[PDB]
Amino acid sequence: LSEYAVRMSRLSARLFGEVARPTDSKSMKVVKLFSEQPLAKRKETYDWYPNHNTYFALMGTLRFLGLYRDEHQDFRDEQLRLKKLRGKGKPRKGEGKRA
Template sequence: MSNINKYLALTNVATNYAKRMNRLSNRIFNEPVRQMAPRDWKVISLLSELPRQKDPEYTQYYPRHVETWKFMMQLRNYGLFRDEHQDFKEEMVRLRILRGKTKPKPGEGKRSKKK
């Protein structure tokens, strides 16, 4: 019999020494020292969790804005997503071009026409 099997057999024995060793092992490995009712396990599980204000999953969460934006623009290019604000901005640029209010090309501005 290996050492582990001897230890397991020893924990099942109801001697005083075995009980004390079992309690000590439970203390070392942060387990409940004595047997508990199932309703008490709920309390232990609640108290063993990190509070939400200290849990990094809640406090240090920042959405991935850049990746989300790029993804939404790709979906918009495929026609699967409608960004009304971007549509509005593009429409304003299109109307400006139709009215002739575009920026002059390099070398065709006001200063070049003075000569």
């Protein structure tokens, strides 16, 4: 390591665009923070979950429009009807145990 090598190391860094002046090991992280995409903005993170609200709502409307027939939802409705017939249904608001 000589003064000649220091100039060459800095001169090469200037042309290729790296940091010219000496930088600490911990101080290089700020370069890494902006060089890479932050974790919270990657497409794998914020788009991880498919939008179940649109998936559920769309098939809900198509079910009522007769274009999509869902067996599973029909099963719940058929059993729910039988519970009402047997006399065991869901009470309204303010009817659980206050009476």
